[PDB]
Amino acid sequence: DPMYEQFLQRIQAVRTATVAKDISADILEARHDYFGRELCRALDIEYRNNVLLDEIILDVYPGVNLMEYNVPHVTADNYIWTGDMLLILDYKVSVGHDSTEVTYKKYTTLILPVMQEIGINTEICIIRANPVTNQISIVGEQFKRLFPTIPVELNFARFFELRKMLLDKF
Ligand SMILES: [Cl-]
Ligand SMILES: [Cl-]
Ligand SMILES: [Mn+2]
Protein backbone atom coordinates (compact mmCIF):
# COMPACT_ATOMS: atom_id res chain seq x y z
CA ASP A 1 0.00 0.00 0.00
CA PRO A 2 1.59 3.28 -1.16
CA MET A 3 -0.39 5.43 1.31
CA TYR A 4 0.52 2.99 4.10
CA GLU A 5 4.18 3.40 3.14
CA GLN A 6 4.05 7.18 3.38
CA PHE A 7 2.41 6.99 6.81
CA LEU A 8 4.97 4.51 8.08
CA GLN A 9 7.76 6.83 6.95
CA ARG A 10 6.14 9.77 8.74
CA ILE A 11 5.72 7.61 11.86
CA GLN A 12 9.34 6.46 11.76
CA ALA A 13 10.66 10.03 11.52
CA VAL A 14 8.29 11.69 14.02
CA ARG A 15 9.67 12.80 17.38
CA THR A 16 7.28 15.47 18.74
CA ALA A 17 3.69 15.42 19.96
CA THR A 18 2.49 18.17 17.58
CA VAL A 19 3.59 16.26 14.49
CA ALA A 20 2.38 12.98 16.02
CA LYS A 21 -1.08 14.50 16.50
CA ASP A 22 -1.00 15.70 12.88
CA ILE A 23 -0.09 12.22 11.59
CA SER A 24 -2.97 10.70 13.56
CA ALA A 25 -5.47 13.22 12.19
CA ASP A 26 -4.19 12.41 8.69
CA ILE A 27 -4.66 8.67 9.32
CA LEU A 28 -8.26 9.31 10.40
CA GLU A 29 -8.88 11.49 7.33
CA ALA A 30 -7.46 8.77 5.06
CA ARG A 31 -9.74 6.22 6.75
CA HIS A 32 -12.74 8.51 6.32
CA ASP A 33 -12.01 8.92 2.61
CA TYR A 34 -11.43 5.17 2.25
CA PHE A 35 -14.91 4.51 3.68
CA GLY A 36 -16.45 7.16 1.43
CA ARG A 37 -14.93 5.60 -1.69
CA GLU A 38 -16.02 2.07 -0.73
CA LEU A 39 -19.50 3.30 0.20
CA CYS A 40 -19.93 5.03 -3.17
CA ARG A 41 -18.65 1.95 -5.01
CA ALA A 42 -21.12 -0.27 -3.13
CA LEU A 43 -24.06 2.04 -3.84
CA ASP A 44 -23.07 2.63 -7.50
CA ILE A 45 -23.03 6.40 -7.01
CA GLU A 46 -20.41 8.89 -8.13
CA TYR A 47 -17.64 9.45 -5.61
CA ARG A 48 -17.01 12.99 -4.50
CA ASN A 49 -15.18 14.25 -1.47
CA ASN A 50 -16.24 17.78 -0.55
CA VAL A 51 -18.67 19.72 -2.70
CA LEU A 52 -20.07 23.17 -2.05
CA LEU A 53 -23.81 23.56 -1.50
CA ASP A 54 -24.06 26.24 -4.20
CA GLU A 55 -22.35 23.82 -6.61
CA ILE A 56 -24.81 21.06 -5.70
CA ILE A 57 -27.70 23.43 -6.35
CA LEU A 58 -26.25 24.56 -9.66
CA ASP A 59 -25.79 20.86 -10.56
CA VAL A 60 -29.39 19.82 -9.91
CA TYR A 61 -31.06 23.15 -10.80
CA PRO A 62 -28.98 24.56 -13.65
CA GLY A 63 -31.20 27.59 -14.27
CA VAL A 64 -31.26 28.78 -10.66
CA ASN A 65 -30.47 32.37 -9.74
CA LEU A 66 -28.54 31.66 -6.54
CA MET A 67 -28.65 35.28 -5.42
CA GLU A 68 -32.34 35.18 -4.51
CA TYR A 69 -31.80 32.47 -1.85
CA ASN A 70 -28.90 33.43 0.52
CA VAL A 71 -27.03 30.18 -0.07
CA PRO A 72 -24.31 29.84 2.59
CA HIS A 73 -20.84 28.68 1.67
CA VAL A 74 -20.88 25.19 3.16
CA THR A 75 -19.25 21.90 2.20
CA ALA A 76 -20.55 18.33 2.39
CA ASP A 77 -18.85 15.08 1.46
CA ASN A 78 -21.22 14.19 -1.37
CA TYR A 79 -24.80 14.23 -2.53
CA ILE A 80 -27.31 12.08 -4.38
CA TRP A 81 -29.83 13.62 -6.75
CA THR A 82 -32.83 11.33 -7.32
CA GLY A 83 -34.59 13.57 -9.86
CA ASP A 84 -37.11 14.72 -7.27
CA MET A 85 -35.15 14.96 -4.03
CA LEU A 86 -31.69 15.92 -2.85
CA LEU A 87 -29.83 13.77 -0.32
CA ILE A 88 -26.87 15.50 1.33
CA LEU A 89 -24.25 12.89 2.24
CA ASP A 90 -21.78 12.97 5.10
CA TYR A 91 -19.51 9.96 5.64
CA LYS A 92 -18.28 9.13 9.11
CA VAL A 93 -16.00 6.49 10.57
CA SER A 94 -16.43 6.55 14.34
CA VAL A 95 -17.41 4.41 17.32
CA GLY A 96 -19.43 7.29 18.82
CA HIS A 97 -22.53 9.29 17.94
CA ASP A 98 -21.32 12.76 18.96
CA SER A 99 -19.79 13.87 15.64
CA THR A 100 -22.99 12.73 13.92
CA GLU A 101 -25.09 14.93 16.19
CA VAL A 102 -22.85 17.97 15.56
CA THR A 103 -22.88 17.51 11.78
CA TYR A 104 -26.62 16.81 11.67
CA LYS A 105 -27.36 20.02 13.57
CA LYS A 106 -25.05 22.01 11.29
CA TYR A 107 -26.49 20.75 7.99
CA THR A 108 -30.13 20.84 9.08
CA THR A 109 -29.67 24.45 10.23
CA LEU A 110 -27.64 25.66 7.24
CA ILE A 111 -28.94 23.61 4.27
CA LEU A 112 -32.61 22.77 4.81
CA PRO A 113 -34.12 26.31 4.96
CA VAL A 114 -32.35 27.32 1.74
CA MET A 115 -33.62 24.22 -0.03
CA GLN A 116 -37.12 24.81 1.36
CA GLU A 117 -37.08 28.32 -0.15
CA ILE A 118 -35.86 26.85 -3.42
CA GLY A 119 -38.62 24.23 -3.29
CA ILE A 120 -36.47 21.11 -3.69
CA ASN A 121 -37.14 18.26 -1.28
CA THR A 122 -33.92 17.69 0.68
CA GLU A 123 -32.70 15.27 3.34
CA ILE A 124 -29.55 15.30 5.48
CA CYS A 125 -27.98 11.81 5.47
CA ILE A 126 -25.13 10.66 7.68
CA ILE A 127 -23.67 7.23 6.99
CA ARG A 128 -21.33 6.06 9.74
CA ALA A 129 -19.06 3.02 9.74
CA ASN A 130 -18.04 1.70 13.14
CA PRO A 131 -14.36 0.82 12.52
CA VAL A 132 -14.26 -1.73 15.36
CA THR A 133 -17.36 -3.75 14.40
CA ASN A 134 -17.74 -2.81 10.68
CA GLN A 135 -21.42 -1.97 11.33
CA ILE A 136 -23.01 0.79 9.19
CA SER A 137 -25.46 3.23 10.81
CA ILE A 138 -27.66 5.59 8.71
CA VAL A 139 -29.37 8.84 9.60
CA GLY A 140 -31.78 9.65 6.79
CA GLU A 141 -35.14 8.02 6.15
CA GLN A 142 -35.27 8.41 2.37
CA PHE A 143 -31.69 7.16 2.12
CA LYS A 144 -32.64 3.99 4.03
CA ARG A 145 -35.60 3.58 1.66
CA LEU A 146 -33.47 3.88 -1.46
CA PHE A 147 -30.59 1.81 -0.05
CA PRO A 148 -32.01 -0.86 2.28
CA THR A 149 -28.80 -2.89 1.96
CA ILE A 150 -25.26 -1.54 1.68
CA PRO A 151 -22.92 -4.22 0.25
CA VAL A 152 -19.72 -2.61 1.56
CA GLU A 153 -16.78 -4.86 2.32
CA LEU A 154 -14.60 -2.87 4.69
CA ASN A 155 -11.23 -3.59 6.24
CA PHE A 156 -9.91 -0.92 8.61
CA ALA A 157 -6.93 -3.05 9.72
CA ARG A 158 -4.27 -0.93 7.96
CA PHE A 159 -5.49 2.20 9.73
CA PHE A 160 -5.51 0.48 13.12
CA GLU A 161 -1.97 -0.78 12.50
CA LEU A 162 -0.61 2.67 11.69
CA ARG A 163 -2.35 4.26 14.69
CA LYS A 164 -1.09 1.49 16.98
CA MET A 165 2.44 1.95 15.63
CA LEU A 166 2.23 5.69 16.31
CA LEU A 167 0.79 4.99 19.77
CA ASP A 168 3.48 2.37 20.48
CA LYS A 169 5.84 5.40 20.42
CA PHE A 170 4.79 6.63 23.87
CL1 LIG B 1 -18.64 24.17 5.85
CL1 LIG C 1 -15.39 10.80 10.47
MN1 LIG D 1 -17.58 13.15 6.53
Domain range for 15 is 1-170
According to the annotation, is 90 in a ligand binding site?
yes
Query: How far does the centroid of ligand 1 lie from the alpha carbon of residue 157, in Å?
Result: 30
Distance CA 160, CA 131 (A): 9
Q: How far apart are CA 52 and CA 33, in angstroms?
A: 17
Q: Which residue stretches of 14-148 are H helix?
A: 17-43, 53-60, 98-110, 112-118, 141-146
Residue 77 annotated as binding site: yes
Pairing of strands 75-76, 78-81: unpaired
Q: What is the distance between the alpha carbons of residues 19 and 110, in angstroms, rounded to a whole number?
A: 33
The single-letter code of the amino acid at 60 is V
CB atoms < 10 A from the CB of 96, how many?
10
Report the distance separating Cα 150 and Cα 42, nearest Å.
6
Look up residue 77 and give its DSSP letter. S
Report the DSSP beta bridge partners of residue 121: 85
62-73 core/surface letters (b: 16 or more CB in 10 A; e: else): eeeeeeebebee
Contact 51, 75 (CB under 8 A): yes
69 C-alpha vs ligand 2 centroid, how far in Å? 30
Number of structural domains in the chain: 1
